[PDB]
Write a structure and sequence with these properties.
The structure is cut from a larger assembly and holds chains A, B and C. Chain B has 3 helices and 8 strands; from the N terminus they run H-E-H-E-E-E-E-E-E-H-E. By secondary structure, chain B is of the alpha+beta class. Chain B starts with a helix and ends with a strand. Chain C has a 5-stranded parallel sheet with strand order 2-1-3-4-5. In chain C, strand 1, helix 2 and strand 2 form a beta-alpha-beta unit. In chain C, helix 2 runs parallel beside helix 6. Classes of the chains: A mainly alpha, B alpha+beta, C alpha/beta. The structure holds 2 RNA strands. Chain B: One of its GO terms (cellular component) is cytosolic small ribosomal subunit.
Chain lengths: 88, 129, 218
Amino acid sequence: SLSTEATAKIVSEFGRDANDTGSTEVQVALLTAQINHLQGHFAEHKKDHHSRRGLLRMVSQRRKLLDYLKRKDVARYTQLIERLGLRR
Amino acid sequence: SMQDPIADMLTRIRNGQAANKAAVTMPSSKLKVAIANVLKEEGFIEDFKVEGDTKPELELTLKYFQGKAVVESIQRVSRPGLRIYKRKDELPKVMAGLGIAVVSTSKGVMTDRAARQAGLGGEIICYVA
Amino acid sequence: MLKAGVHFGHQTRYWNPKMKPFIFGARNKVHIINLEKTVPMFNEALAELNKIASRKGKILFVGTKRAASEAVKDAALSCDQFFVNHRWLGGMLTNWKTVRQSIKRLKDLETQSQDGTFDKLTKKEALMRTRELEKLENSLGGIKDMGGLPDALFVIDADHEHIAIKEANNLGIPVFAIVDTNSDPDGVDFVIPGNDDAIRAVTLYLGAVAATVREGRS
RNA sequence: CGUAAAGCGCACGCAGGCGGUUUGUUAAGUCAGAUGUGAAAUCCCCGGGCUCAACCUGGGAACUGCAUCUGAUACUGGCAAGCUUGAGUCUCGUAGAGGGGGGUAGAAUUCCAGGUGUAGCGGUGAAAUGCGUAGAGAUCUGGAGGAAUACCGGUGGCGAAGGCGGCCCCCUGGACGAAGACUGACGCUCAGGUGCGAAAGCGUGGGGAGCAAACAGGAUUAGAUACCCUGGUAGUCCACGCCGUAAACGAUGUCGACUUGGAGGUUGUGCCCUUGAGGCGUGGCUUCCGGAGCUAACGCGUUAAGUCGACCGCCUGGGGAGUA
RNA sequence: AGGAGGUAAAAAUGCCAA
């Protein structure tokens, strides 16, 4: 679901303030909060191919933002992935 | 994906004549106003206006002689998938002279006849038949 | 200036969008034509047909619509001019070298029946010719007095009589159509916007085109 | 490249290609001038010499090229600071056969046990095979089992496509609307690559009412290894793997911009008199008709097959052959 | 203007070129 309670902690933890729901670092932390969340959902089913496509959009949405941020603001790019534990 | 607003300008011009409209309004530019000068001095249009401050909408004004369009046919040549530049002596000519060809030279956005008389080539933007 | 209490408009949604130069919506969603653009163009037309009236030009009138045929018969003989008030004959102007052959057939049977052979050989077949006559009397009405092609053509409904406007534009004939909002005003040269399904509306245009062409026949 | 040969079944996506807008810088691309060379002959030009011609010769032109230097800076590119209209996020909500999982209900068929009851039933163009006096079929009560969800239901809704229909819960994708806020071009497309992909098949293990390839019998027929009749196994069902094809078809790739209208469907939303099946708007999606235009025509026609732009796929007479 | 039910046993082929 990624409830209104759930996201409001994420935008405060990463944004320039609580009104800054638009930043690159905010959106990536929103996606990794949800990509990790549905890993529990996509274990017992494993054959729901429909809603799996919405996860692959959330993956590819995350991948395009990191490549933008790495091209832009390298100091924060190597700040986020060690704040999240991703990128291989 | 509006990846060429210059071709969008002429396609607004071309469809604007076929629909017998009065004006055609489009987002402004540095290059689009530079082309619209060359048509205005040529008499292909009436005077334009750049309406806006931060979201600038350039508007135009069409011309018709009898019922026919003043612009016969206008088509872009150096498209963003294939850009064409020519020298001074290998400049083109539209309608064997009596059609214009707005070119882009290092000295500015000039006509076919002007930059040949000024003696320099450049980027051939579009022909106006 | 309200010249009379009807010019307004008709057809209420069946509007040709090429009459967007003169429209106005209403409560019943009808397209009203405003007078401020047609009454100069109405007075444009009344001057332009007096220019050809001075040439002693033949002006022909058309339009039936079951309720306009009555005064077109009246306004044509009001000055001197010509008219087709009944059901129009498709191909009479661009094939005038074949409708003249029935005009010549009319003026035989109009002459002989009005005095002479209406009894001489067969009484039943004499009723055949006067059954032939009166249907030819209305179809070829005031055309038999003209001879040759007209010079202009005053139409009261563009949509209904669309054959003639296409027929007259095949030749060099400047036409004059009272147009309704549903028709297309392209073949007509001197377009006149206004209502044409009210009887009181038609007597304005027919009364104006008759009295003006009387002034033009000086 | 709708139907003549040709849009990958559909999607995501790396390399590749293309990119809004404002300012500055550089000057790679590009343009200008000059030098160097671009062998001569040959071609071309203006000339000359063999009686002319072919042949021979003088000068120019050319060699469309690359390299250098000085420049020019619109445009493209590189770099730096932006901006918001492109994309994206967040808040409140709406609609839905979107998906996965687990329950659950009624009608019906078949079957099983019996009650009553009596000679046919069933089927067909007609009949027969079959079934029935061991008591069928008809009827009533009861029980089991599987599969599918009447009515609603509609060119209605949803999904990238395939596809999806009782009801309920749980997990869960996506779209859309209104008023604000934020990030600042983060975009489009996509070879190879990866993923989904009807039905039928295949593998294992269950399930098996109905239906029905094969198969058998009866007819039919010249024959009928067919339609039709009576049966009837695989199969259809479920769980998990595989196959990867369809007239996988609006026979129409994806994205964006622009260009007359009209009648509806569906789902939001604002205002107004809710004052009653409203009135005027403003969005998304969808069906039919039709103008300009286009088209070989038929027809498409703001959801284009119109007018253009960016990338990708593919076609080059028919067969042989989508075969070796 | 709207709407319901009913309505065929099998039946093949015709030389080559003009």
